[PDB]
Symmetry: D2
Subunit: 238 residues, 4 copies
């Protein structure tokens, strides 16, 4: 049996147990600021990610066991103009050596918009901009090896309000669940889908966040994570 | 700081740390069987509840702090005839000396269908039968001092399938959230509402389940809880 | 799998999830005051206990599995005259319906000084007074069904200083371990012994504290518990 | 608030969340084998270490808080000849970039036997061989910036038996406590001392194990870790 967990109720600057990639900083107020902010305003064509430093053991090929995990986080997206919000934020699992990919609507996760098993990405996206591959309206998606989501639901962005997310994986039913709640307006969202982690991901992964502002100057938003817990449990064989 | 927690991944017979009320038994397969089953079939006019034996400290009048809590459970409802399903199951918080009330659509929680502050009940209901006070269709509700829910959502009962529920209370936003997922069909439901526990409940409560089969012989279903975790945290002041 | 846990970093007055027995009160400073205090001084012939309200499932006769547990607590003993300190404090496990027994050197645990399997008591004692059955000097003991300890070590009472205790049970080796640390003086104590909980205790027990002041007016001390955590885990069968 | 934790009830081969240094391997039976073994006999002049991959945030200079932590582990030392046992095992905290130092009685921790504040090492040692700086007999020591322990106790090595260790740090009293229990013989050991982590260590550290076999062919032993849990909690400011 192997477990990993961590809790950040706020972030400290220069976090040596986080791998910050692209534009990501920790602010002095303790937020994980994924996309760049200049003179109080979001900057376009910005891409940031943040990963927990230690690899997570999510499945074992010797014993053929798969881990459960649950993560929670709070985030804020602030678009100066809501109709021109872009591009979004995602929580993801990826190979240990993962590096930022294309900015914009590919969210730093993929180098193109195709399906490809060699990506080894599972992600939950909070997608604020309609690209050619997206359904109509802002949405939450479960993504496996592609920016084109396996399943989506409608989600109305509440601008500059705190969103509380929980994402969990139940290995016995191969089910990934993702929920978002806005306590300020009592609005909530949920979806789940079958995802087989053993087929998709390597035995060890890194986990974290990615976000991207839009590729034109008028399509911008901030993406701040305020807090983050993670728990995984790789059980004994059964 | 005060915390309480417990986990049952299955139930043992004669559980001395559970207060079983009404018809409740533990089966040999380790399920908490809330309504009576005779010759493989559910019995009508059955009422059962089950509560954790220790009172939970959910708020402190000395320090004026309120607890957070999160509970998870799995349940199954099996109606021999789905169109004649009744009456439902609920998770609730109530005063320590709580006793079963009226059977049927009052779910063992209330002695009538009125709003009354002296009930001191907060509950999440999984309501399989439309009474005069209910909205159309089977539904999930948040209930405060009344069988008439403060807020509801549509919920399609998946007969004899395992439902995974999580209910949580965030004291800083006074928000109660309830989710239900069916991993078998990848279907999921969520709602949340403002509930002020300090106004509604006494400082110590008991927590648990209640269920009721219908009051006519043809309107019946089973109500089994398979597993239950509970966690509460009453923080230090300020 | 069944787990129970709780944490009190301090105690609130009228604690409804604790069974207070004998003289026990909660002070305004949030201490669990086991033996009586009058005009700033300890009172003789005083006996107090305190138990967590919910029974603990420590072993299951169906599956023949036994729980692990760990408990921690901080206590203070203040003897006005150290040479006349009596009688002591103990942490114990006992049947659910347990009631206080004889005061004095029997510590509220036993009705006599003999060995008897029908007691169903396992205890760790912090013994400040030499009775006929005791070794020389103040000591810590592991006690099974008798005030005459199965094993003891020397322990020097540090008067009015905070003692941090941890007691744990490892079921696979049948080993009970007890440690005491005084952080003020950097002094520490440990012992362990084989105890088979399945032979000694019923399936469900209550856990908590007992203490007794001496049976003459000049042989007195206070016994205050400042904080208490408990964790038990009854695993799935092998 | 920041917490880190992990649990290994056994080890898997090629553990990507452990930084293995020197001779360390994971066996097929799931042991962390710190010093080299050639066909079930220990090899001399062997040095191995193992660290959790993620840095631990043990204190924060912004908020002036210091973390508590607790770690537990099980180890086995098997000396073919007990009288010629060498050199030992240690649990330690060190700067993130820490590298193995001198083999033998310096245990892979230090490059010499002097006191030096630029080491930034806190360690608990299980020392099986008497060097010039050591007290008489095999012993457990608390070490701050030097192989010459700040405090020691006598410890009798029980050859090829499982030792259960717990080490904890209480920030409010600046107290480091270390215990060892042999459940097989019911023997146990404990010590504690004042250590101010803020003065000694950087804000982020790595934690783990080191071990060394002796520098002559007849002074050898194995050093296997069977299991390891770690928990740290860097609290919010008052
Ligand atoms: C482990 O604990 C067991 C109880 O948990 C012990 O068994 C019990 O032992 C008592 C004697 O102590 C038994 O009770 C007695 O029954 C006889 C015969 O009917 C009575 O003569 C006797 O009453 C007289 O003695 C009392 C003092 O002992 C006086 O107070 C009383 O006034 C009489 O003069 C006594 O009966 C009890 O009297 C008080 C009433 O409140 C009570 O209802 C009444 O029972 C008792 O029956 C027995 N219990 C059980 C369930 O068996 C056990 O003691 C050992 O075994 C017993 C049977 C005796 O042989 C003991 O000599 C022996 O020690 C004890 N074991 C040890 C090693 O301590
Ligand atoms: C699905 O994903 C795989 C793995 O990422 C893609 O194959 C890889 O494509 C890279 C190019 O983007 C290859 O590396 C290149 O090597 C050449 C020299 O040989 C260099 O000049 C160049 O700068 C790159 O480093 C990489 O080697 C290749 N790996 C394999 C196993 O083929 C794959 O890309 C698609 O197939 C490959 C073979 C190429 O034909 C690509 O053009 C093509 O996009 C991905 N498949 C799809 C359909 O996207
Ligand atoms: C809200 O719920 C409370 C608590 O259940 C109701 O108050 C209770 O009303 C009962 C009457 O139905 C009282 O019982 C009676 O006691 C008297 C004297 O002891 C007997 O003569 C008689 O035979 C009954 O058995 C009960 O004592 C009372 N309890 C309390 C704590 O007040 C309450 O009912 C409302 O207020 C009460 C005081 C009456 O005025 C009712 O008429 C009135 O409905 C409920 N409130 C509402 C608006 O429904
Ligand atoms: C393929 C791609 O990244 N498309 C981006 C879109 O995601 C969004 O950022 C938009 C804002 O103007 O510009 C497009 O270039
Ligand atoms: C108030 C009440 O219980 N009404 C019951 C309803 O809940 C259900 O049991 C049904 C089944 O026939 O009978 C109704 O008249
Ligand atoms: C058997 C018994 O309780 N003996 C007590 C002893 O514990 C202690 O209190 C002492 C002090 O004066 O008095 C004795 O009566
Ligand atoms: C400084 C040093 O490492 N001394 C080592 C001692 O630790 C032990 O290994 C011994 C083997 O018999 O050889 C000594 O030289
Ligand atoms: Ca998009
Ligand atoms: Ca109804
Ligand atoms: Ca005594
Ligand atoms: Ca040495
Ligand atoms: Mn999308
Ligand atoms: Mn309803
Ligand atoms: Mn004694
Ligand atoms: Mn030494």
């Amino acid at each position: 049996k192997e477990t990993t967990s961590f809790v950040f109720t706020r972030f400290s600057p220069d976090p040596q147990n986080l791998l910050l990639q692209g534009d990501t900083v920790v602010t002095s107020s303790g937020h994980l600021q994924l996309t760049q902010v200049k003179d109080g305003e979001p900057v376009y064509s910005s891409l940031g990610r943040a990963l927990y430093y230690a690899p997570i053991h999510i499945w074992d090929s010797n014993t053929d066991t798969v881990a459960n995990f649950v993560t929670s986080f709070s985030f804020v997206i602030d678009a100066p103009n809501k109709a021109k919000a872009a591009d979004g934020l995602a929580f993801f699992l990826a190979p240990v050596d993962t590096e930022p990919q294309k900015p914009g609507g590919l969210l730093g996760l993929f180098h193109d918009d195709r399906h490809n098993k060699s990506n080894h990405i599972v992600a939950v996206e909070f997608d604020t901009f309609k690209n050619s591959w997206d359904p109509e309206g802002t949405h939450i998606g479960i993504n496996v090896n592609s920016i084109v989501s396996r399943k989506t639901i409608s989600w109305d962005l509440e601008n500059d309000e705190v969103a509380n997310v929980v994402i969990s994986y139940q290995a016995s039913t191969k089910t990934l669940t993702a929920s978002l709640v806005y306590p300020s307006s009592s609005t909530s969202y949920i979806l789940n889908d079958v995802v087989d982690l053993k087929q998709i991901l390597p035995e060890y992964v890194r986990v974290g966040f990615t976000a991207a502002s839009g590729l034109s100057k008028d399509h911008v938003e901030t993406h701040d994570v305020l807090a983050w817990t993670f728990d995984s449990d790789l059980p004994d064989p059964s």
